């Protein structure tokens, strides 16, 4: 009753061009079985959204990667928010929610916007730059580590650690084994920076520790919550901003609409999140026998959600393969959905908005003028190099 497919969603060929395989995954049925990894898969919007909003059946406490925490030991201590279910998830979620709250955005916006405007002006003086190294990575590195309150020493470990984190959600393929092997130096740095003495007062890290006074988290939980932000707060925005620039480079008509109305910056970034879905997939584990799309899934089964496929499902989106900065993007699952929806989504959107604002006001054209190279990761979709020429407005 359930179609069995041999597609490896974590193969380089899949990363290189996943859209044909994603349609095959959607059209095969509402629920598929991937024989390559012995997991169930859902690629349509309806089922993906349903699974995300059914946390008591499709839990996260057994890991959101392929590995089942009930069967294998996690490569690192489990995340207190991402890899937990209610009610354990609730209070740590509230702390991060308050640390990264709307009120908090008010304190960082001006600095974040200034850094974006300055970076775009700097890149315009160069002309031909790498939109990844010089923009997608440079800007987040210039604002987020400081917003966390991190020291200068050791920041070179931040992106390597993130790449490891997101590769480790995948199956035990070469990408994951290479990332976990000899990762101790990255882990030692991050875990050290998670301790209260190493976080500058006023930053996200210190603010997390400050919440230990309230009873919402204990002092020994605060380092693991800081670890969450250090795991998810940087690499995500790199591929998010990189996706937006990549879209603007490929759709000149949409860059021109953005130029004509810079207030579309925020929704231009949101559409890029839908269009590219920098976070491609996550797993859930069934806590009981459950019927999904006419298929009966047993207990303790892994279920792979194709967030990117769901964001391009023609059953839900008109012209899903078109970048449209005025699209009504509400309902896309690029940030998740339900109790686990991205708690850092205001930080991501703030970075994306202010960078696209800067481009909208300062740049007239973005032309790809060099070899484009894709960056392969079991969970993240993004580019390794994006040579572009920036024409000043
Ligand atoms: C474009 C940028 C980003 C994207 C596309 C993204 C995507 C996501 C997604 C899809 C989830 C759901 C995970 C799941 O359902 O298992 C999630 C959760 C989470 N994200 Fe984001 N994220 C981004 C940026 C950030 C930032 C900037 C931060 C922190 C500063 C962050 C921190 C977190 C945390 C802590 C969670 C766990 C939430 C929970 O389990 O309740 N992310 N993110
Ligand atoms: C896209 C994204 O943020 C996924 C993610 C979320 C939380 C954590 C964590 O360490 O708690 C790690 C990864
Ligand atoms: Cl770690």
How far apart CA 350 and CA 218 sit, in angstroms, is: 30
265 lines ligand 2 (CB under 6 A): no
Residues with a CB atom less than 6 Å from ligand 1? 60, 64, 81-82, 93, 96, 100, 228-229, 232-233, 236-237, 240, 273, 278-279, 282, 334-336, 340, 342-344, 347-348
194 in ligand 2 pocket by Cβ < 6 Å?
A: no
Q: Which domain holds residue 190?
A: 1-393
Helix (H, G, I), strand (E, B) or coil at 54: coil
The SS3 of residue 56 is: coil
136 lines ligand 2 (CB under 6 A): no
| Collapsed DSSP state (helix, strand, coil) of residue 181 | coil
Q: How far apart are CA 324 and CA 327, in angstroms?
A: 5
76-85: string of b/e by CB count within 10 Å (b at 16+)?
beebbbbbbb
Q: For residue 141, give the CATH number of its domain.
A: 1.10.630.10
Distance between CA 91 and CA 216 in Å, rounded?
Answer: 5
Q: Are 264 and 325 in contact (CB under 8 A)?
A: yes
Q: Which two tokens stand for residue 381?
A: 């979709």
Q: Give the method used.
A: X-ray
Q: Cα(314)–Cα(259) distance, rounded to whole angstroms?
A: 29
Query: Residue 31 is encoded by which pair of tokens?
Result: 């629920």
Cite the beta strand spans of 27-180 per DSSP E. Answer: 32-34, 39-42, 58-59, 128-130
Per-position DSSP letters for 188-254, written without gaps between them: HHHHHHTSGGGS-TTSHHHHHHHGGGGTSS-TTTHHHHHHHHHHHSSHHHHHHHHHHHHHHHH-HHH
Cα–Cα distance, 210 to 280 (Å, whole number): 33
> Is the separation of the CB atoms in 269 and 356 below 8 Å?
yes
Is any atom of ligand 2 closer than 6 Å to the C-beta of 337? no
**Cβ contact 115:145 at 8 Å:** no
What's the CA gap between 280 and 17, in Å, rounded?
A: 13
User: CA distances (Å), 184 to each of 191, 219, 359, in order?
Assistant: 10, 24, 39
Q: Give the count of domains, the chain.
A: 1
Place of tokens 């850094």: 115
Tell me which of 48, 232, 351, 379 to substitute to probe ligand 1's pocket, judged by most ligand atoms within 8 Å of the beta carbon.
232
Nearest to 38 by CA among 79, 77, 76, 67: 67
Encoded tokens for 155: 């920041």
Candidates 79, 223, 377: which one to mutate for ligand 2, based on the most atoms within 8 Å of Cβ?
79
Reported structure resolution in angstroms: 1.8
């Amino acid at each position: 009753t359930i179609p069995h497919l041999a597609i490896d969603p974590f193969s380089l060929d899949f990363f290189d061009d996943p859209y044909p395989d994603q349609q095959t995954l959607r059209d095969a049925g509402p629920v598929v079985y991937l024989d390559k990894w012995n997991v169930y898969g859902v690629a349509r919007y309806a089922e993906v959204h349903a699974v995300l909003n059914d946390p008591t059946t499709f839990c996260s406490s057994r890991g959101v990667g392929l590995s089942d925490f009930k069967k294998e030991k996690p490569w690192r201590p489990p995340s207190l928010i991402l890899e937990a279910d209610p009610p354990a998830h609730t209070r740590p979620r509230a702390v991060l929610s308050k640390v990264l709250s709307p009120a908090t955005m008010k304190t960082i916006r001006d600095g974040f916007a200034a850094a974006a405007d300055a970076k775009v002006d700097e890149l315009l003086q160069r002309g031909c730059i790498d939109a990844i190294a010089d923009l997608a990575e440079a800007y987040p590195l210039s604002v987020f580590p400081d917003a966390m309150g991190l020291k200068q020493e050791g920041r070179e470990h931040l992106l390597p650690y993130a790449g490891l984190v997101f590769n480790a959600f995948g199956p035990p393929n070469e990408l994951r084994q290479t990332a976990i092997e000899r990762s101790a130096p990255h882990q030692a740095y991050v875990n050290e920076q998670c301790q209260r003495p190493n976080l500058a007062p006023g930053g996200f890290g210190a603010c997390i520790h400050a919440f230990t006074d309230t009873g919402e988290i204990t002092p020994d939980e605060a380092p693991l919550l800081v670890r969450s932000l250090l795991s998810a707060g940087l690499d995500t925005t790199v591929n998010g901003i990189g996706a937006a620039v990549y879209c603007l480079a490929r759709f000149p008509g949409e860059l021109q609409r953005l130029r004509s109305d810079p207030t579309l910056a925020r929704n231009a970034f949101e559409e890029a999140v839908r269009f590219e879905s920098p976070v491609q997939t996550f797993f859930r584990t069934t806590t009981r026998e459950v019927e999904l799309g006419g298929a009966v899934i047993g207990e303790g089964e892994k279920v792979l959600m194709f967030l990117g496929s769901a964001n391009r499902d023609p059953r839900r989106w008109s012209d899903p393969d078109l970048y449209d900065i005025t699209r009504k993007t509400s309902g896309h699952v690029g940030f998740g959905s339900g109790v686990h929806m991205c708690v850092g989504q205001l930080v991501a959107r703030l970075e994306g908005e202010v960078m696209l604002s800067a481009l909208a006001r300062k740049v007239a054209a973005i032309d790809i003028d060099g070899p484009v190279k894709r960056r392969f990761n079991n969970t993240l979709r993004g580019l390794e190099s994006l040579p572009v020429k920036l024409t000043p407005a």
